[PDB]
Amino acid sequence: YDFSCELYRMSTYSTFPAGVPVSERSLARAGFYYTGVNDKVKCFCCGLMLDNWKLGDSPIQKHKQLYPSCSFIQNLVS
Numbered sequence: 614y615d616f617s618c619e620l621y622r623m624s625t626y627s628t629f630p631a632g633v634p635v636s637e638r639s640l641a642r643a644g645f646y647y648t649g650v651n652d653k654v655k656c657f658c659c660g661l662m663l664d665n666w667k668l669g670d671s672p673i674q675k676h677k678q679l680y681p682s683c684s685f686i687q688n689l690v691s
């Protein structure tokens with residue numbers, strides 16, 4: 614289903630900057646791929662864009678909170 618998709622998302626983090634305080638795996642699992650700019654990531658499903666990640670930030674929570682209508686985030690959490 615989203616099998617290869619999550620794996621593709623993971624691959625986009627090859628250039629992710631070193632000091633970002635959230636794991637790339639968690640980002641990719643939350644539906645986000647890396648835009649190649651700063652620490653800005655984008656949902657493959659709804660296009661929600663997020664950057665300036667802080668220690669302890671939950672990509673899934675931010676995702677659910679900001680753009681609940683995303684089918685991916687709805688199905689991930691259900």
Ligand SMILES: [Zn+2]
Nearest residue numbers: 656658659683
């Ligand atoms: Zn989304």
